[PDB]
Amino acid sequence: AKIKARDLRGKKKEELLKQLDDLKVELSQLRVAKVTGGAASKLSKIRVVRKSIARVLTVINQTQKENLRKFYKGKKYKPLDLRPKKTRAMRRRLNKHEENLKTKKQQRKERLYPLRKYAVKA
């Protein structure tokens, strides 16, 4: 038996939670098998069990994050983990509109007196 991410991303959370609980029950039973001696064919199994627990938790958190973004998208004052992350200087960028926003005198000056294209040989 295997645990695939494409298999996990299609199921509902009420089945993912029960499958995660089953994985943690197997986690605890193979921890008991790790503490006791004669269970040597179970240690790669507890390795792939804890990797599967990580996979199921990752799929659940991906589903919760996209489900949050589906209704925080397009809303004013979206939360801090959903705001862009990039770096602090890129947060203190003004805007593309605030960068392109020009005063009326300079706009009318560029309207009246534009830059020309030419060549001077003859």
């Binding site: 039973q29 008991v32 503490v35």
Partner: protein, 58 residues
């Protein structure tokens, strides 16, 4: 049992009652010098520690 250090007597008692379906009389905790917590969980007299140990596999 061996417990993470961020837990207390009440969390150990609730964890044992909600996992092993058994009642707990008391919990005595010490810090094992390797870095973990050693918890002595004494059960109710209605339950049998040998039967619980055989069901959990130790």
């Amino acid at each position: 049992f061996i417990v993470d250090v961020k837990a207390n007597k009440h969390q150990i008692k609730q964890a044992v009652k909600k996992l092993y379906d058994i009642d707990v009389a008391k919990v005595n905790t010490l810090i094992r010098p390797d870095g973990e917590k050693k918890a002595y969980v004494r059960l109710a007299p209605d339950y049998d520690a040998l039967d619980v140990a055989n069901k959990i596999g130790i």
